Structures are given as C-alpha cells and as structure tokens.
Write a protein that binds this ligand. Sequence first.
Ligand code: NA
Ligand code: NA
Ligand code: NA
Ligand code: NA
Lengths: 283, 283, 283, 283
Amino acid sequence: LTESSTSKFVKINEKGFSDFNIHYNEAGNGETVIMLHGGGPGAGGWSNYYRNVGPFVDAGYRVILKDSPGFNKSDAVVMDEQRGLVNARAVKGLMDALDIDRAHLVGNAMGGATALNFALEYPDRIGKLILMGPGGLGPSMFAPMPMEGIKLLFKLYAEPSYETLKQMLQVFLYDQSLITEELLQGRWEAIQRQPEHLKNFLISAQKAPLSTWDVTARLGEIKAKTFITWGRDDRFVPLDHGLKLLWNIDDARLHVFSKCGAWAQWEHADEFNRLVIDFLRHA
Amino acid sequence: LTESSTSKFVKINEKGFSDFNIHYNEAGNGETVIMLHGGGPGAGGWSNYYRNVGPFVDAGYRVILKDSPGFNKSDAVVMDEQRGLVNARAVKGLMDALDIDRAHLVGNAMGGATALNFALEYPDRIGKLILMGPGGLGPSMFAPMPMEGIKLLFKLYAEPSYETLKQMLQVFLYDQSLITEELLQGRWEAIQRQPEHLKNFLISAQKAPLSTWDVTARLGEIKAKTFITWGRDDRFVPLDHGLKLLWNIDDARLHVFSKCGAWAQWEHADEFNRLVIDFLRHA
Amino acid sequence: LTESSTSKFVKINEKGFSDFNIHYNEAGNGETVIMLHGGGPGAGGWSNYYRNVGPFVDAGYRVILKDSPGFNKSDAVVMDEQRGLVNARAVKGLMDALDIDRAHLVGNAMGGATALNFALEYPDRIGKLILMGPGGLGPSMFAPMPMEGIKLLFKLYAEPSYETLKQMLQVFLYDQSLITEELLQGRWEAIQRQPEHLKNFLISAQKAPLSTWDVTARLGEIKAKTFITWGRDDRFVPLDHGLKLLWNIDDARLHVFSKCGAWAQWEHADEFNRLVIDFLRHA
Amino acid sequence: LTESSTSKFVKINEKGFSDFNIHYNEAGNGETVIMLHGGGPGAGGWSNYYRNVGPFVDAGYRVILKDSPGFNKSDAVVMDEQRGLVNARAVKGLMDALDIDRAHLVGNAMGGATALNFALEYPDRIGKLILMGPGGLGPSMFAPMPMEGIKLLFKLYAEPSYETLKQMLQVFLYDQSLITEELLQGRWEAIQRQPEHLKNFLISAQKAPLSTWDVTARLGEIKAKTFITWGRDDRFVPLDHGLKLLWNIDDARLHVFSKCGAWAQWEHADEFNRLVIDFLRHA
Ligand code: NA
Ligand code: NA
Ligand code: NA
Ligand code: NA
C-alpha cells in the first residue's frame, strides 16, 4: 500500500463545516477503523500510521487514515473551539459523507482528544475506542505543564525550521536512532507545503487554549469498550493521564510500553498492532 | 482437565531442601510454563490457575501448576529466609528433578516474588517472565502498608474461620458476586486439611518479615522479556509497584485491568489468557 | 479550657434550615477560625480539635469548634444533598447568627469537603482555607475505593459496637498506642447518646452518595490562600488527592506528615499547630 | 551582608583531598547551618542562597554557604566517583578544618545528594537534614529521564552561551519574570570566569554517571530529623522523589510549594525561610 494509491478526498457538511475538504488514505473493505493523528507541525494520517495500515487491513478492517481540518491535505481552518471537539465533528461529517454507520477509532494525543470528543458527542456512531497518549485531559498530578513536547510543538509552529523539527522529533521518540532523514524530510515537506496550517494553528491556539480541551468531567458517559496505550517515556502527554482514563471510563484497560515516546503505534508498531487487533476482535 | 487427573508429586533436593515433596498439576507437552500462586491461607496451584491451564495447554504449552513449599499438598516447612527466594530454589529443584532446562514463569503476588527471585538467581533457566501484582517490592509511594489484604491474610492465618476467609476473599476480588460457595469451600478445605501450613507461615513471617523480600535494587539484572499485569483495584499489592517494575526492568510492559482485584488471571481470565499467550508466542 | 466551659448553642436559618440547633465550642476573642470535623460515628467539634483549640486561642484567634448537622450535639437531620454542601450552608447560618463577617476554616475529611464547599459558595465570607485529608474529591489515581476507613465508617454506622469502633480507630490512626480507653469511651458515648444520628447518616448516604460530593471541577474558582495537609498513612482519604488540590487551587501548598493517619491535627498536634498558625499569620 | 564581606577560604584534607581550596560565605555565630548548592554551570553558595542567609543569621544561626569542589571559587577537580559522595567528604573536610562538631545541612538538587551522602557517611556530625528537590535518587515513577532541566544543564556545560543560560534558567524557574539581567549576568560571570569547571564536570559526568548517585537503598539508615521541600513545577528533579524520601526516611515531612521550580529557597524565599527556621528550632 502507498500514500498515493490510497489517497482520497471527500467534502464535508457538519455544523460549521460547509463543503470542507478532508483528505484521507483508505484501504481494506471490512469494519471501519478510523485513525486520527497528533497536532504537531507536519502531522498527517499516512505518515503517522503507515506502520499500522497494512497489518490492520490484513486483519480484515477497512482503515481510514484521516487528516484533521487544518492538517496536511485537508482544508485550512481557524478554530474558535477546542480542537478535539471540532475534529470530532469532522469525523462525523466524514462518516456521513461515506455512509459509515459505526466506526472504531484509534487516536494519539490530539487524535485521542478527537476520539474522546467523538465518543461523547456521538455514542451511537462509535464501536471500540482506542487511545494512545490522548491529549486534552487537564493538569497532570506529576508533570509540570506545558509538557516538554508541547513547548517544542509551539516553538516549531512559530519558528519553523528543519533544525527545530529535529529537536522536536528527538523529544517525541524514545529511540533517537529512529530519526532518519526520511522521517525528517517527510515532516519538513508537509510543513513547507502548507505554511498557512502553522499560522492557523497558533491563531486557533489563542482562541481556545489547551485548557479548554479538558473533557475529564464527562468520562463517565463513555460506554465504548476502551483500550488505553501509553509510552512510559512520553514527553508530550503525561503517563498519569493514563490512570485517569482507567479510573473514569467504565470499561477500560491500560497498556504501557517501555522505551516508547509519544508514538506508540510507530515505535512499538508490531506489539501495538497485535494488541489492538486482538482487542478489536475479542474484547 | 481436572485437579485429580493432573495431580503429580516430585521429591526435590536443592540447597536446604532434602527429599522435599512438591505437589503440582501438569497438562500439555510443549514448552514449559510454570505457574506460581499467592501466599494466603488455602492458596494452591490448581485453584489459583484452573481458569488458565486449559487455554494455555490448548495453545501448545506444557503447564505446571506448582504448590510452593508449605502450601496445599507440598511438604510443610518453616522458613528463615524471605519466601520469594526459598520458593525460587524449590522451582529450580522441581525443574532439575523433571529435566526441564528453561521455563516460562507466571506468578501473582508471592508467586511473582517467586518468579522475580528465580529470574535473578537463575537467568539461564528462565524464558519469559510474567508477573501479576508481584509482592516483595518494598514500600508503596501511595498505599499505606501493610495493605488491606495483607492484614486480612495475617488475620486469617492466626484466627482461621470461614467467616474471616469470606472477608478476605471479598477484599481480594473486585466483583463480590464471584465469591461462590464453591470458591469459599475450596479454600476452606485446603485450610482445614493442613493446619500445620498456617502455624508455619506465621513462624516464617517472624523469621523473615515481608520487608526482607524486597528485591527492587536488583531489577536491572533481569534480562528476561517481562510482562507485568495489575488489577486497578488490587488491595493486596499496590498498583504503583507496577510502575516500579516498568521503569526498572530492561524489557517490560504493563497491562492493567479495570474492575479487577488481586487475581487478574481469575477475574479477567479470557483477556489474561489472550495477552499472555500472545506475549509468549510473539514478544 | 474544657468542653463544658466552652459549650454554646445557636439556632440557624439558612436555606432548608429553620431554627436548626447547632452546638459549638468557642474560646478566644480575635479573628475567627472555624474548625470542622470528619463524618465517622461519634465525631464532634471538641473531641476532634481539643489538641488544637488552646494553642490557637493562645495565638490570638477566636476558635469555634462546630458540630455539623446530624453530628454530636447539633440537631439530627436527613440530607438529600451531598454533605459537604449542606454543612457549608450550616457554617454560613452559624456565621450570620453570630455576626461573623469572614472566618478562617480548618477541616479534615468531611470537614474539608465542608470547607471546600463554603469557599466555593461564599468566597466573600472566608479568609484562609486549611484542609486536612479533605473528602469528596472523586476517584483516587492509586487507591481502590471505597477506602479502607470508609468501609469501616459504614460498618460502624450500620452495626455499632465498641469493638467495631476500636477497629475503626485502629485504621484512622497510624500509632495504635494512641488508642486509649478515654479516646474509645469518648467516641462510644457520642455514639450511644444519639443513635438517631447513625440511622440518619445511612439514610442521607443513600440519597446522595459520596460520588456526588466531588467538587474537583470547581477548584479553579477558589481564591482563598490554601494550606493542604495530609497524613502519609491516611487510610480514609488517599494522599494523591493532596496533589490534586495543589495543582488545581491557585494559591495552595501541601504539607505531608510521616507516620500519620486521618487525624493530622491530633496525631501531629504540635507541628500541625505551628504550621497553621504561622500560615494564618504570615501567608 | 554581602558576598565580598562574607567571603572566606579554607584548605581541606579529607581522603582524596589534599590542601584543597574551598570557598565559602559565612555570617552569624550560633549553631552552624551549612547550605549546599546545585550543579548547573555557574552555580555557587552565595548566588544560590543570598535570599536565605540574612533571615537565618537573624534567627541566630551561623550560616555557611559552601562552594562544592569544582564550583565557583572552590578548586577545580575531576571526579571519578558520584558527586554527592565526593561533595560530602568536602563538607566533612571543611567542618574538621573549622572545628565544627555538628552541622545542620540545607541542600537543593546536587546539594541535596550532598546532604544525603553526608548524613549516611557521617551520622555523628549532622544535626537536622533539609532537602530541596535533592538529586541522585534513581528513576522517577512518572518523569521521563533525563529530566528537562538535566538535558539543559548538560547542553550549557558543553556549549556555554548567555542564550543557552537563559533557556536553562527559564526551565529552572516557574515565574519567568524572575529572570532579571542581574541574575543572568551573575551566572554568566561564574561561567566565564572558570571555564575549566565546565570541562571538568563533563569529564566527571563520564566517569560516574548520575545513575551511580542513587542512594535510595540506604535511606533507612538516616536518623536525622528530615525536612523535604519540593517545587510542584520542578523540571529538574521530579516531584515523586519527594514521596520516595517521605516513605523511606524514618522521621521526614514533605512541603511542596505551588508555582515553584527547582529553587524553592529563592522562588518562595519568605515561606521557605519561615518553615525551615521553625523546623530547626522546634522539630
Ligand atoms: Na541508524
Ligand atoms: Na450469583
Ligand atoms: Na500506652
Ligand atoms: Na520585571
């Protein structure tokens, strides 16, 4: 499978979206699993999930790697509400556009916030909920905030450069030797190609700070069977938020990988793929 | 499979064991997995692991449910050293007696301590290491100690009764409705049948308090791939000890079940069986 | 100072209170400090705070040891709302009755919940806020719940006896040797003298479970300078709730005593008195 | 009091120190309190503790602000052992040189490690032990390591500049507006004046990594009454290490300041001074 061969576009009309263009990558034909990416500069569906799409399609799922509004090849946008909620509406727009009745959701950090808000706003349209270091969930009990990777996400947004990109990825990833030229260049190109996305993010950040993403008080509403994953060494969203989900969501479990940063799905792809597919099939 | 049909005995001679009788239950013929039980009154191999032996044998393993010295049908004993270490020597005695070169180990609480000490003392004789709320690991950062279930373990040892047994199990188990007459009676009978085991445990407790079981300082020596499980609601060994293992063992992961007490293998048998078999095969 | 010599009554009329009788013990004449007790059977103002009233009066404060509605010598009551909120209204009733414009509040567990709700409902009527293991604050990230001491509080409410009282105090207190006959008898007598209080508590518990006391989502509203204390070995309200306050209240500090249960003010009276008086004077 | 007017030198001869020059600042004449600084580039006794020396001398203590070997005006040095232990020997050398029989110790981060090692090696020569975010204590249960401020400490050591210094202080301090030119310049000058100190630190870092400073396993030996302080927002040494001390030292308490980074003594000087003096007098 390739980015090019799986690349699709769809216009959406959900709420304050009107004929809004969403880019995604799709493969397979079984039950739908929608995978949702983080919010750093240059993030997108394909580069975040390319280590996953194949095993999941192989296991029989239809996989959709969605670009959130204001990321990668989806339309530019300035948000006045918390990103998790706006992205969730986009997911629902996408699903109605494609005649998808229920989907499983997978999401890291911002995409986790996205998945969380979707489960809350639309409980009839979700199957299983899968979270990797989901953002949004308020103050840590242990981590000073803003987290190390958050500060770097904002620095990169405001003063983009290959050098600052590398610094940021070095913090995202436990194993530094995973930071190949290819990974860097791929991020650099998404950054270079849509400079408007950066300015828009910082604007949206001002209109609705991360403090407003916090959906903790509503976790008890979630009736989705939930799989929570964390990297032990995640410098982007702190590990004790994993405990907070486990205590507050009715039917949750938590899996924490050693020697893993903010991209469990990428840094521990094989075991990640095994646990989540097993969960999707059997939980 | 039944207790009776799988029941075996073997004499061991490792260190301060001489012709010491160990009871176990065995089934299957593939790679050996030795499962090790907790230390409460009436604990034993078969009643702790009967929800596991079948799926594991079905997956191709040879499973051995071992009674630790001074439990169930294994010989009575008074220990002057920490139980985790003495039990580990017994496991090695058992393996040499049966011509087993390497085994996978599964152990909850005391059996976890057992598995930990075995991996440390005999790294050439272990494959994979599997821990469910392992005891021994020193002070909690959050839980006052002795833990709630520990106090009840000692109360039951000293004043045994069906009523105190029920109180203890009510604390061990998240879901109270799992405490059937059958479960109670089975524990009551192991208690009633070997009263010497109780007096011996309290004696051993005095000669080597739980404070001496702590092997934390040596966790870095463990080269076994490690799977750590915890119940979120474990009132016997606290959850933050799961973090301590994840940070200190080189190649570990942690899985925490919601709505689960001190017996993950029993309260969440299906998912437990799936995760550990997958881990044994693929990690 | 004695219970008898300081004993006062006042009728209150705040909201769903009409000519409601509140017992308190008062001494000193300076700035008012109102001290509020926990919710176990037999709790009351004087026996909870008798190690404190003297040093605080000596430091120049006017001290009021209040019995909450449905405790000790205050009127019996059946509550349909969360106790923290109803007690707070009682405090405001008491202050209006006595022409007190602002008070400092001190409260452990239920009394902490009380102090929290008061600061939220009436920010113009509080000076400094002092909390010792305040209840109410939702799920722990580490402690299974109900906490050990909560279960014992409910057992004692439902089957009152001197023996169960002793068991409960043994869990409340780190140092067991502090559990003198005098302490036990004093609690036994408050229990024996107002049996209606017990039945009423369990009734109120049913109408508004502890789950409804949780005021976490509103902590950011509190503008009071806040002093949080915890016993490290508190088996009643878990220690990580202390972190939750420190991160969520604007101007807070946290002090944790070693070898201390659920009554810091009693078990570590001298240092407790020194820290809080210093805080009242200088913070 | 000024740096210049309090500035003293003393040669020491303890172990692998021979006629080794130690700079300190001293004022007052009562019981000795020795204050020990952190290990970042440019750290020293006077600039770390100038907000403290006055109130402590005013309270009647003799205060000694010691420069550790290889810092500020003390002799340059390359260490092959963990810094906490070598600094402790220097403190003992200093005390024997000045005919000081017992001292109270105050130390943040590296100086905390220093104070810890001193209490362990020389229990007859310490009074009270005071720790502010002490380094050395092994892995965090929550914080990825190296901590954010550690990475910056090493960056500054290796590529010193005013700009990197500012970045580092911005991480050390909760309130950014405390980073005046004066503070920056003072650090820049200690850096510029003794470039050998930087190269030596990195060399010593290689010979004895921070991993070897960990004295956790020996905390139970400490019989000093202990006061532990932490900033809630400390990005240099993580907050849960404060819990680890509280559970492992026999007679400890913990005080955590809100809105405080790695220098509690400086960022919250007034309350810091009040708590520690009160502790020194009364605990
Ligand atoms: Na490479
Ligand atoms: Na049933
Ligand atoms: Na006594
Ligand atoms: Na300024």
